[model samples]
Target: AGYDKDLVEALERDIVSRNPSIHWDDIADLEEAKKLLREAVVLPMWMPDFFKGIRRPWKGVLMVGPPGTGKTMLAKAVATECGTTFFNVSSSTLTSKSEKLVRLLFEMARFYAPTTIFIDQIDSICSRTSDEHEASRRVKSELLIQMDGVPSKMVMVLAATNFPWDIDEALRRRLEKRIYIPLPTAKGRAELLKINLREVELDPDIQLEDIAEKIEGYSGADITNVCRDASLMAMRRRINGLSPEEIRALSKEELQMPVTKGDFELALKKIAKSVSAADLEKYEKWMVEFGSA
Candidate 1:
């Protein structure tokens, strides 16, 4: 009741949705991560009494992964699936007022219990390096203090970080469930391709399994990029060598060509995998040392 109105308004702006429209089915792969999240976020609410004492729901769940591994999407799905009031806060959102803003954020979260507070790119906000500004140090301290106070409530703090190793130990300790969201497996990649190409027509000759195999090491976003480029290839070919007038004159039906295997080949050439093997190795090593689940 004593909270600053401006800060409360700022935090309210970050409330992603009562419904974000992303479900567990919409996202492909990371079945383990999905299951773990369901247990951590969904199950706790359903059986609150069972989760008390040693089985209490986690204070926070950290999603550590390379870029575009669907961390944000998963959070949205959690909000949708669990029917929670979702607060989608990012480092940029908190950096403005820092300490008080964070304090107010949690206060608001408790106000909306059965809520999910998703802090995206948390590594940028809570880095361990001594070189971090004093302001940042205060922010991290406020965050940790807020997390410690969250045990009794239904509010769950879900954080996603591309650089999980950069987070300080104190914050890491508060985020009790740290899971890896790695690149898509072969099957997952194929599923991802199918999801991305749901609307566009695929040529009978274009094999999803073949495309999935060749695009090994690509992130989900990378695969989406490939699909987007490949899907556009048909239209690109239709317009090639045509003048602006001719292109404009072409009807939608005339330009609607099936995406071919050759289109995927061209897309593959244009969009390479973003995450490198060395980067993946580092994540695995860190998870081995500090990850919880």
Candidate 2:
């Protein structure tokens, strides 16, 4: 029946992204976490012989942080850098997501050995719980069994979660390295803004540092939202004197304008940071207690 082919066909459409573009340089910071991840997953795949004995490959790594902290971005980079099949799951397309007799997840990971099976929002999938009726608990248990029982050599499972404390103890222990993906630093925020707004025409007086200072506690996604709003501000300016019909008839080229620093300022007034101070404190406390490997 060509079992391997069947597995590949079944998951052919499940690939995460087109070529996994982001590299270490593309991201802002989290240098230590990147280094640790490289050592754990990338190094082993690059040179299995070298990673033997004391440097065995990690079965799983848990990335914990607030929303939009670039956990997903980092995972994609790992997939691209290592040249592995990425099985993106959780909260969207998975057994639990659909509640089905769907084929097993880790089995697919095993079939596609040296795979990066990414589970986003890991806390939801591996949430601490009891009661056999709970699908999530079984999903969590099956994940553990698959990682250990399937001889998942060369298969690296990476998971990301906003709330690390909600994960089951057994699953957390198995996940090994728990990297905290905190809010972007000032430099990181500036880099993110630059990356997001690279296509936009910035005014001569526009300073990323000034924007970065005003955007304290923002995540990568939040920066992107600001950039989007700023871009819209520029577009809105182009449409200022046009009536409804005139606007509809206006040429695309005629509706373009440079994004001024004022656009960004206006955007900042509209888009607020999603993560609160209290949530950040909880993440810090959890990191100290369980995630600071």
Candidate 3:
């Protein structure tokens, strides 16, 4: 069931070198969660002697959360930051890559000690078994053996899914640790908007946290959409007529000059092309207790 496609040793070496660090901050909020995770998994790599009393490989960690919460993002960030060998044991990759998957998986696991063997949406390869789906059942069995079979020092498995309840019970047990990523809170939504708005020129009156308060129960992705929508408004206005110097001159005025409510209203309306009753209604459904700002 595992793919045996062999990556050349050279290719393996390059993967380890070219990418380092899994861009965690790119993911919204969850900073505390990220810190806790690093303390458990990655820090041990640096403080092995300090952890001599408890140094042991984690069988795996399972990331669970609502849809669009970026469980996979967290995994990728860990792999990137740690330079850990990473893999996605999801349906698409497994079915196509075939037997070579097993070889390459172990190769990276073995060669990249302190490696992270990431399986995004692991529920794909590890659905609950049944009599009718014997081939898939066998595939699941093979995957487990491979994960647990890899040499201990070289690997740590990280699996993530949006739905933990949907995973095979046996495979679930094997994962050992489960972490949930929740929908963003009000404060988190504000942070998400601000960060995504980093590159944009916000109208002076535009305050991210204020906008976040207006959109209660919004997920990180939803808040991100607000900034994106607003940015495009500026871009469109800029492209319609202003030369580069004119654009720069206007921005300097904004910084050292006074801006009007009209400027803000126009920017908000333009950038906020997505504003509507429907957007609010959709996001409100996710919040346990959403109310007007």
Candidate 4:
């Protein structure tokens, strides 16, 4: 599709990345999560009448997982699939004591009906505590009030966190549907590698299958870092003696040719897996106690 001149310019001013119109296919694995999310959120928007009375659309969903497991991307997929306005808010926005700011978030989403408000790292804003500070507590109170009365079809709240147990129990109740996104399985790791390297020019010696097996416990972010590091290795090869203009003119593919298995090996040495065994054990314990239905 061609650009909408005014809308593009306005988004640029606001520093908003245009929603990429991501579909579920863009994401790998988590078939069950994808199916549940589609039914809970996406289907209702398309067939509003069918989901009336007891079968209404789910207004909130909480994705609990290790960092860099693609929770944010799932939220983007929801916005794209629903064809809704995406309001990606940070914890800082919610923690600041301003009823007006909280109200503005609600008002803006209401103004743009069928909006998805993605609260990233929701634990930071609504951590389990009733006695933080008077002002911040008031801000949380305002948020709850806004959430309750919104027309269900007008807005949906999607939140992501690494630590579900830290969220306020009251807030957790409001975020009714919770799913635990665990680390990638062996098959999932292979898929991640394939996706990461799909656009890069690979050397004949570089095999995705071999590398995938080696990166046994890597998260999506770790895999991404590996790809980045490998590309950097190539860039380091020819960055010297080139004019700034020449560097700028050179395409990434031109300078970083034939990303190799050896580059990936070197990257593995430098980058460690972010999710550790102890971290996994903690998440498992929480999941057993208060995870999902």
Candidate 5:
């Protein structure tokens, strides 16, 4: 509770600032969802009369979609752009032992009202009544109370959960605008590959465009993982104890850095361990029909 300011700022600076240069533009292919949140959800909180405020500025947003779909990132984007404080509240923070944790949650929510509460994986804390312990009821109750409290200038809650159905009904009531964070489209995935590879120098033999086309159902996070794997694959090829001069000269050529077919080959091997073969199929289907790369 006492760490409200520090927590909020840390979330903003560290997580949300990942691609501040992109202006939400780097987030490709989710324009419709992005606009809805920015214009409908966040704008009203920024300036009322637009929302018609019969309700509490649509305080709760559920970003339910497949994992690695950037639901959490989207929450941060809204918070950072709005200059709103972001609170990442979830079951990890709220335990049954200390119903006081829920009480503490409210204290922070109240402390950060008019601010944005980015509750990543929100369903964890807001379970059904029968499923919930006596402690959590009090916790959820305080949640409702604080969320329903009079419009605070800086406090609002932007919650995201991969499992939307698990949240309790009462908790849902407090989360006004529930948005689905679906899997990334072909273009979104392509842009993601392009963006992540921005620093790398592509080999004359490698075509990222082809790589993007190949990455069908992969989420943006998946793309990042693949890109990172490719980097490591390159690293493995070279000896790590190279001299500083060797490291310095190892640009795209030295690091063997760049998006390539073999890099992707190695990357897929690594990514496969992380994502299911079944899930990867979806992207393959999309890649065949929808994209050019």
Candidate 6:
């Protein structure tokens, strides 16, 4: 009734077990993406009958974006929102990269109907290049075959990639709904700061809006890094002139200083935005050519 028992066990142990319970609310922005996912994945599950004939659900949904734009979080949120069995597949987990393993993955997905197979960094496995290994080619071919054979039984293939241009045309064609997860807006950045600094005590003079305005072009993860560095600035200053023994002797109350505007300024100086305007243009251009949502 199945492929190899060991292979099945391996997939179950490595991929299916990682159930990150990230909800839609946990993420900050990309309201458009949220709406699109709800329609593409969520609605189909709820209204299965309507999703027949011309209204059938998509076979695959590809999330293309720059690094640290919360693409993984979006995939997790989709699984949580849909209440489906999630498969967190990646190049690392698909270690063997054999045809049999690819077949087994889809077979297991069929067994667990209403499954969301999230292939993170999919470009690494299915890149379009002239000089590729035969083994890798076999794996990609098998993957394509398995994806094509997937029935409209709520087994959705959700993939994310930083290098969308590198993905194979065959794979791209199968991923019917390609959504662009762009950088967060100014408002979203402010919300992200609020989320990151919820526990840390902030100085009364520290304006989140001012800080948000200053961190233009920063991704969600970049903003988080800035917040982390800034939050520690106060603690760093507390033990600046003290010896190890004296620093250890200090009370916890003495070290619990509020993060000030100066700390944020220093953090901003240290951490630069990861994405550039030219890189943004590349994404926009690709979206214009191939983006679906």
Measure candidate 4: CA RMSD: 5.2
Clashes of each: 0, 0, 17, 0, 10, 0
Clashing pairs in 1: none
Candidate with better TM-score, 2 vs 3: 2
lDDT of 5 by residue, 26-50 (tens): 4667776697678646677557765
Off by over 4 Å in 2: 1-15, 46-51, 55-57, 92-103, 126-133, 150-153, 239-254
* Local accuracy of candidate 3 as per-residue lDDT tens digits, 136-242: 56666767787667424557777777555567867876776566566777777767766776665555665555666766655566556555555555556545686
Clashes of 2: 0
Cα RMSD, each candidate: 3.6, 3.9, 8.2, 5.2, 7.0, 3.6
Give the higher-lDDT candidate: 3 or 4: 4
lDDT of 6 by residue, 1-293 (tens): 35578779977887864547789988888889888877887887678689974587777888888889998889888888877788888853474437778888888888887788888888877543343455567778998897887634567788898888989889888898888897888888888989999868998888889889888899999999998998887888877867999888888767757898899989999999999999989999999999784
Please estimate how well model 4 matches the true structure, expressed as its whole-model Cα lDDT.
0.76
Q: lDDT at 25 for candidate 4?
A: 90
Q: Give the distance in Å from residue 66's predicted Cα in candidate 1 to where it truly belongs.
A: 1.7
Give each model a TM-score.
Answer: 0.84, 0.82, 0.64, 0.84, 0.73, 0.84
Q: Cα lDDT of model 3 overall?
A: 0.59
Model 5 residue 75 lDDT score: 69
TM-score of 2: 0.82
> Which pairs clash in model 6?
none
Give the distance in Å from residue 25's predicted Cα in candidate 4 to where it truly belongs.
0.8
Lowest summed lDDT over 10 consecutive residues: which window, candidate 4? Answer: 8-17
Give candidate 4 misplaced runs (Cα > 4 Å): 1-16, 46-59, 93-97, 127-135, 151-153, 241-251
The TM-score of candidate 6 is: 0.84
Off by over 4 Å in 5: 1-22, 53-59, 93-97, 126-138, 150-152, 240-260, 273-293
